[PDB]
């Protein structure tokens, strides 16, 4: 959990303009959060990048979880192996507001982070899920009470987040 170059936003939320895959390889955190979908099909965005960094080991494992347990619900999570990126991967489903999923479930999605003392994570429901990433940061800040180190890939997005927060 050797995080470096993070800007402290609140007592428990830190942010960095970084590739979450590279942060996971450097830090080897106890928990890396995946911005997952209900079937754990890691086809793009952070999910695609984390799965690609495990050479598809995350996807094989996720398919077996789904065969045995069925899909997650929107706002829910499951803990699986972190493979070579972390001890554990907490897969969390935020709402896809572009598919009419309720934004109220973004709070429920972030509540899953509270079962873990320290996490390396992306912002939830950003990108293709369609939520406003600055709103997603506000929900994170209001909801997460454990220590969360957020990695943001896009410098343009990172600068907008840091400008709006501090
Ligand atoms: O910074 C992020 O968490 C976001 C995105 C993203 C996309 C593609 C990535 C590819 N490799 C690593 C991280 C990536 C993150 C898209 C929406 C917000």
From Swiss-Prot:
What regulation of activity is recorded for this protein? Inhibited in vitro by GRL-0617.
Domain Macro positions: 1-166
The observed outcome of changing residue 30 to A is: In strain: Mu/B.1.621
Compartment annotation = Host endoplasmic reticulum membrane
Entry membrane topology: Multi-pass membrane protein
- Highest taxon above the source species: Viruses
What result follows from mutating residue 163 to L?
A: In strain: Gamma/P.1
Which reaction is this enzyme known to catalyze? Answer: Thiol-dependent hydrolysis of ester, thioester, amide, peptide and isopeptide bonds formed by the C-terminal Gly of ubiquitin (a 76-residue protein attached to proteins as an intracellular targeting signal)
The record describes the protein's role as:
Responsible for the cleavages located at the N-terminus of the replicase polyprotein. Participates together with nsp4 in the assembly of virally-induced cytoplasmic double-membrane vesicles necessary for viral replication. Antagonizes innate immune induction of type I interferon by blocking the phosphorylation, dimerization and subsequent nuclear translocation of host IRF3. Also prevents host NF-kappa-B signaling. In addition, PL-PRO possesses a deubiquitinating/deISGylating activity and processes both 'Lys-48'- and 'Lys-63'-linked polyubiquitin chains from cellular substrates.
Q: Subunit details for this protein? A: May form homohexamers. Interacts with N protein.
Name of this chain's protein: Papain-like protease nsp3
Q: Which organism is it from?
A: Severe acute respiratory syndrome coronavirus 2
Shown portion of the complete protein runs from 1026 to 1191 of 7096
């Amino acid at each position: 959990n050797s995080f470096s170059g993070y800007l402290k936003l609140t007592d428990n939320v830190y942010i960095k303009n970084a590739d979450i895959v590279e942060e996971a390889k450097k830090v080897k955190p106890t928990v890396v959060v995946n911005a997952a979908n209900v079937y754990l099909k890691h086809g793009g965005g952070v999910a695609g990048a984390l799965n690609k960094a495990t050479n598809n080991a995350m996807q094989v494992e996720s398919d077996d979880y789904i065969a045995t347990n069925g899909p997650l619900k929107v706002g829910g999570s499951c803990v699986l192996s972190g493979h070579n990126l972390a001890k554990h991967c907490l897969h969390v489903v935020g709402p896809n507001v572009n598919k009419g999923e309720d934004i109220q479930l973004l709070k429920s999605a972030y509540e899953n982070f509270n079962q873990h003392e320290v996490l390396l994570a992306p912002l939830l429901s950003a990108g293709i899920f369609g939520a406003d990433p600055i709103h997603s940061l506000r929900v994170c800040v209001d909801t997460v009470r454990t220590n969360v180190y957020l990695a943001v890939f896009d410098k343009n997005l990172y600068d907008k987040l840091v400008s709006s927060f501090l």
